[PDB]
Amino acid sequence: ASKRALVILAKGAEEMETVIPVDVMRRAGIKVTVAGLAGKDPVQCSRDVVICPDASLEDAKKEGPYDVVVLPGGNLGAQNLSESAAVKEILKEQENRKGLIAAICAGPTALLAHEIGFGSKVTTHPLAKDKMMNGGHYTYSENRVEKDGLILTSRGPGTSFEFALAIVEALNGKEVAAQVKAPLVLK
Amino acid sequence: ASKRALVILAKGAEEMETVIPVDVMRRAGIKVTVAGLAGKDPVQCSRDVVICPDASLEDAKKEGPYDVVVLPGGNLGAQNLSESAAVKEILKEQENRKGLIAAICAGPTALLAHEIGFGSKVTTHPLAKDKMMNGGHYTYSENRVEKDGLILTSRGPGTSFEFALAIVEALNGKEVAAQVKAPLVLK
Ligand SMILES: [Zn+2]
Ligand SMILES: [Zn+2]
Secondary structure, rough: OOEEEEEEEOOOOOHHHHHHHHHHHHHHHOOOEEEOOOOOOOEEEOOOOEOOOOOEHHHHHOOOOOEEEEEOOHHHHHHHHHHHHHHHHHHHHHHOOOOOEEEEEEOHHHHHHHHOOOOEEEEHHHHHHHHOOOOOEEOOOOOOOOOOEEEEEEOEEEHHHHHHHHHHHHHOOOHHHHHHHHHHHHO | OEEEEEEOOOOOOOHHHHHHHHHHHHHHHOOOEEEOOOOOOOEEEOOOOOEEEEEEEHHHHHEEEEEOEEEEHHHHHHHHHOOOHHHHHHHHHEEHHHHHEEEEEEOOOHHHHOOOOOOOOOOOOOHHHHHHOOOOOOOOOOHHHEEEEOOEEEEHHHHHHHHHHHHHHHHHHHHHHHHHHHHHOOO
């Protein structure tokens, strides 16, 4: 029974923070759905890479629930996630069922917007710290990956492998994470 | 006068090895063209991420020459690159004009197929070593990034940032590379 991941892809998402987790999760045998916030049309990422989603978010939701919901960063992508009523519903449902939520870079600021996981330790990109910490609803961490129970956060493009492997470990265990890691030629 | 990069994208390419260099090069102010080997249609990468190219290779060639030609890895992508007469022509032209060629993971095996850069020190993914070394036409290196003049090679998804930043340094200099590196939150 393969674990399942929903990756929510919005215009302006950081394409490295999208593709690295998708690829690494698929290497781990996770069934990943790349869901387009705006529909099933191609998505123009922050550095103009264009990714064609597997499904619209609307359709992907109907196939839930998922073992993890993943929010990439990119400031504009995160803002689009933060403004979305559909994302709010998905995240609240995931929180209510005690499912993992993973967000990287500016992505965690969508948790703030949707009032998810208050009281957790979190990290973000350094430049997103002040936005995330508005109101003091979370406790800030400088760890490259932070995990406080079912809220898993990370910092930037250069922490994306660590973030992805932390998701793999949480879903499929340490041994699978180590097996997936070795062929990547990480330092 | 911005430097220009051609990234040749074939079915089965490693999507991390494609997107990380594209994104990092664009962060460096390089004008990058993601060119589809097969045409301007979407490309299904090795772990099923679908990327929409900027142009067909046919059209992209007409807008050359480029300051760097970049070959991602992925075994099936590299095989498609290795079988392509169009890629052969582009690489030979680039070599003849003393322009940089950069290849990662299985990507360097397309250099072997097209008889490019013989006598250079190169690296590859560990699993691609024997293919690359058939005939002894190159000298093998275990360095995470190897550069022997105008032939720049690297090893895997986990060396992609290092590979991309080496390209940036070669084109735009050490200072730009350092400036681009810091916001990435690399270790
Ligand atoms: Zn980011
Ligand atoms: Zn590879």
